[PDB]
Each structure stands twice: as C-alpha cells, then as structure tokens.
C-alpha cells in the first residue's frame, strides 16, 4: 500500500471494522523490529499506561518523552516518569503565549533500522479506545552503509524537512535523534512533511511552516470549483467574521493548486450524545462557549460526523484531516492528516510575518509523489482511504456544534447520563 495511512482500533465495533486497524501495542510490537530506543512526542501522557504498551522485552529500552508542560504540570509529568529510570524528558520551549506542544510522533530506532510514526493520538488509554484517530507509518528506513556516500533523501525532501523540524526545538536531547536520522536512508518516503513550530516567520521563512508551508507545496507540486474539506476536533477563535482569517488566509492557502466551497466537519451535540462514549467523548472536543459565542457565523460551515464507510460514526473523531475533493467527491487532489485543529495557533496568522503558537505535525499525500494526478476515493474504507463519508452532511436546523463547557441535561446519552461540567 502506497499510503500507509491507518485508523486506530476501536472497541465496541465489529471486527471487520478493526481488521486493517492498528493499536499502539501493534505499532510497538516485536514484529515491527528489534527496539533499541524510542522517542514519543506528544501533548498528554499516562506513563504507567505508555510503558505497558511496549512489549515486555522492550520496556527497559530508553524512551524520551517530548512534551511542552510547564511548572506544576511539568513537575507532575516528571513524577509520573520517576519509577522508570530508562525514561528521559525534553521540554519543548513554548515562548509564545497560549501555545502547546501538540505534535504526535514516534521515532522508533531498531537494530534493523528506523521508523517514524506521525499520528493524532495522545498517549493515554482513552485516545486509543473508542475514538477515530489517524496514523501514518513510514517504511522501515535502513541505516546508511558506512563507506557509501548517500544523502538518503527522498524526492519529497522528507529527511531534511524532518531534521529542520527537530532542529527548531533547539534541544540537546533531540540532537541525538537528528544524528540518528542523518544516519538512515529515508529515500523511499512518498509523503511531504507539514510542520508548525512556534515563532514569527518573515521573508522566505514564512513558507517553512503552517498554512504557508501547505500553500507552498500545493503551488509547487499540485473546473476548480473543487471544494476544500476540513475536519478537526477543536476550534480556536477565528475572529468576528470569515474574512478575518478563515476565508482570507486559511482558505486561500488550501485552495492553492499549481467561490470555492468550504466544508468543515465537526461533531454536533447529537453526534456526541449518541457516540460509543456518550457525552464524555466531549472531553476530547474542547470548543469553549467563550470562544463559540464570539463567532456564531462559523457554525453555518459545520457538517456532521458520519463515518459509515469505516464503521465509526459513533467513534468521535480526534483525527484531523484536510483535503480537496472533486465536485462529485469521487476523487481528490490531495489529503493531509495532521495534529493541527482549526485555529490560528496551529496554522499561523499573518502579522509581514506569520505567527505560530504551537508545534504541530502532519503528512501530505500528493498524487504527484506517486506519479498520479489524482487519487480515486476508496468507496469502502491508488485509491485513497478517506475515513469518513462523502459528501459531508450539513447540520440540521436543530443541530448545534459540540461545546464542552456547557451542560446538556434535556436528553441522556448512550449511557443514560447527563453532562454537567463544573
């Protein structure tokens, strides 16, 4: 399979929906290779749980947790790690206010080579239980034979791009991982890396990250009434109206190729209420009332979560995807899976300079990287496995976007419960 794009396993659905799916234990299994050390980039960790995901034989191998926690949260993370002397931590610098280290990535070094995993899940039980999450698995990258003189670079420039991403942390513990990558052959990589890193970027550096990075790749490597579809689990404040950022800079970047319809997929209250988890699913869809009330104009772009194609309509989405389907949705010009949600913090906002608050990371699937002009959409999850149903379905007149910090008490959920934050 050229894509190596997978969904996580979901408990509570029929086996046929989990046949081509992966659980974290599968990813860290000995069949994937003989582990030497690993790095886990993430936002939230449950260390006890994480260590138990590693095979008993690999549990004592060194692990670097790359996080962005500060002060008491940091102290708590260190406390969690104390019992396992093989674990080290790297605190990603967040020098801009309200940023987060949101990137989800695993670097897995084996006796047999190196694997890179870019995904959407936090390292806590809940994120791998009943949610729709995405995973990209790199090939097993062999080590470069001393004596040979090789870049190990791919036509997508993944190797250099990944090193620039890590270089941006300006972190001692990452240097060893940079040197490790240098030593391996990543030439088989057929995806483009799309990262965000905190900063204010000017001149040419604007194209290095966020939506300008996506824009640059689409211009260089890609009846244009083809819609843009955005699908995510959180929404930041986008402004008083669509012209402030959504339709002006975000949409502009995404429509780039070489009156466009913008469809946004985000679960409604009903989607959450009737999910496998019920309302608690909503603890992982953090759209706040304070933010939403300021931007009701946005909700007219909202579409329901529906994933019959992958048997996941009841598995709330934590994956984030962006794509450009044809007018009839039978094909797509490109597809991106990433940790970036719908917000300026993740994607960047122009100030000229581009301001980004967080670390985010995703991979872009372009037909040209496979020598194609388009991908046909796989109907049932060269044909790209879109994990939700198309076309997207608009919210009904009585639907509301899930907002996590208000109570829902008129209708009980899947488990007979109400939701009362506070």
Cα–Cα distance measured from residue 117 to residue 330, given in angstroms and rounded to the nearest whole number: 28
Q: Quick one: 46 and 127 in the same domain?
A: yes
Cis peptide before 106 (omega within 30 of 0): no
Last residue of a domain, one of 190, 219, 242: 190
* Claim to verify: residue 90 and residue 228 sit in the same structural domain: no
Q: Of residues 67, 101, 102, 211, which has the active-site annotation? A: 102
Specify the length of the chain in residues: 422
| Active-site annotation holds for 303 | no
> 107-142 in b/e burial notation, b at 16+ Cβ within 10 A?
bbbbeebbbbbbbbbbbbebbbbbbbbbbbbbbebe
Q: Do 57 and 205 have their domain in common?
A: no
Q: Please indicate, yes or no, whether residues 219 and 130 belong to a single structural domain of this protein.
A: no
How many domains does the chain contain in total?
2
Give the span between the Cα atoms of 234 and 341, in whole angstroms: 6
CA–CA separation, 342 and 227 (whole Å): 17
Residues of the domain holding 139: 1-190
* CB atoms inside a 10 Å sphere around CB 415: 11
What's this structure's resolution in Å? 2.0
Tell whether 343 and 374 lie within a shared domain.
Answer: yes
Which of 174, 190, 206 finishes a domain?
190
Whether 143 and 227 map to the same domain: the answer is: no
Regarding whether 365 and 271 lie in a shared domain, the answer is yes
Q: How far apart are CA 114 and CA 19, in angstroms?
A: 25
Together in a domain, 141 and 13: yes
Residues 234 and 334 in one domain: yes
| Way the structure was solved | X-ray
Contact of 360 with 336, CB cutoff 8 Å: no
Nearest to 138 by CA among 171, 181, 168, 177: 181
From residue 160, alpha-carbon distances to 187, 412, 416 in Å are 11, 51, 52
Same domain, 241 and 119: no
**In the listed set 190, 225, 253, which residue is the last one of a domain according to the structure?**
190
Which are the residues after which the chain is interrupted (C to N > 2.5 Å)?
222, 258, 351, 381
Separation of alpha carbons 64 and 86, rounded Å: 8
213 burial level (CB within 10 Å; 0-12, 13-18, 19+):
buried
Residue 60 phi, psi dihedral angles, 5° rounding: -95, -5
Q: Are residues 216 and 148 in the same domain?
A: no
The catalytically annotated residue of 101, 211, 303, 318 is 318
Same domain? For 244 and 393 the reply is yes
Lay out the sheet containing 134-137: strands in order across.
5-7, 134-137, 114-119, 105-110, 35-41, 63-67, 87-91
Active site residue 102: yes
Question: Residue 315 is part of a domain; what is its CATH number?
Answer: 3.30.870.10
């Amino acid at each position: 399979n050229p894509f190596q794009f997978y969904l996580t396993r979901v408990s509570g659905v029929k086996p046929k929906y989990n046949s081509g799916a992966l659980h974290i234990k599968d990813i860290l299994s000995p069949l994937f290779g003989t582990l030497v050390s690993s790095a886990q980039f993430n936002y939230c960790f449950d260390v006890d749980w994480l260590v138990k995901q590693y095979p008993p034989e690999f549990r004592k191998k060194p692990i670097l947790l790359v996080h962005g926690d500060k002060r008491e949260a940091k102290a708590h993370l260190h406390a969690q790690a104390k019992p396992y002397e093989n674990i080290s931590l790297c605190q990603a610098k967040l020098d801009i206010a309200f940023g987060t280290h949101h990137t989800k990535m695993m670097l897995l070094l084996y006796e047999e080579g190196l694997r890179v995993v870019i995904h959407t899940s936090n390292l806590i039980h809940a994120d791998w239980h009943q949610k729709t999450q995405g995973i990209w698995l790199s090939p097993l990258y062999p080590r470069i034979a001393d004596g040979t003189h090789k870049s190990g670079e791919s036509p997508t420039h993944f190797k250099a791009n990944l090193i620039s991403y890590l270089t941006a942390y300006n972190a001692p513990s990452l240097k060893e991982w940079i040197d490790v990558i240098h030593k391996h052959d990543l030439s088989e990589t057929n995806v483009y890396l799309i990262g965000s890193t905190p900063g204010r970027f000017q001149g040419s550096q604007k194209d290095n990250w966020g939506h300008f990075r996506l824009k640059k790749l689409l211009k260089d490597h890609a009846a244009e009434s083809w819609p843009v579809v955005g699908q995510f689990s959180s929404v930041g404040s986008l402004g008083a109206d669509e012209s402030k950022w959504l339709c002006s800079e975000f949409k502009e970047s995404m429509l780039t190729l070489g009156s466009v319809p913008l469809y946004l997929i985000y679960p409604s209250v009903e989607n959450v209420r009737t999910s496998l988890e019920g309302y608690p699913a909503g603890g992982s869809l953090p759209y706040s009332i304070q933010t939403a009330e300021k931007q009701n104009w946005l909700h007219s772009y909202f579409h329901k979560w529906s994933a019959e194609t992958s048997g996941r309509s009841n598995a709330m989405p934590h994956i984030k995807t962006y794509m450009r389907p044809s007018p009839d949705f039978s094909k797509i010009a490109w597809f991106l899976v990433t940790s970036a949600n719908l917000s300026k913090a993740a994607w960047g906002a122009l100030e000229t300079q581009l301001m980004i608050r967080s670390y985010e990371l995703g991979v872009l699937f372009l037909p040209s990287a496979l020598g194609l002009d388009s991908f046909k959409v796989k109907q049932k999850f060269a044909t790209f496995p879109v994990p939700y149903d198309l076309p997207p379905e608009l919210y009904g007149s009585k639907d509301r976007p899930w907002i996590w910090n208000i109570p829902y008490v008129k209708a009980p959920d899947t488990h007979g419960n109400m939701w009362v934050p506070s």
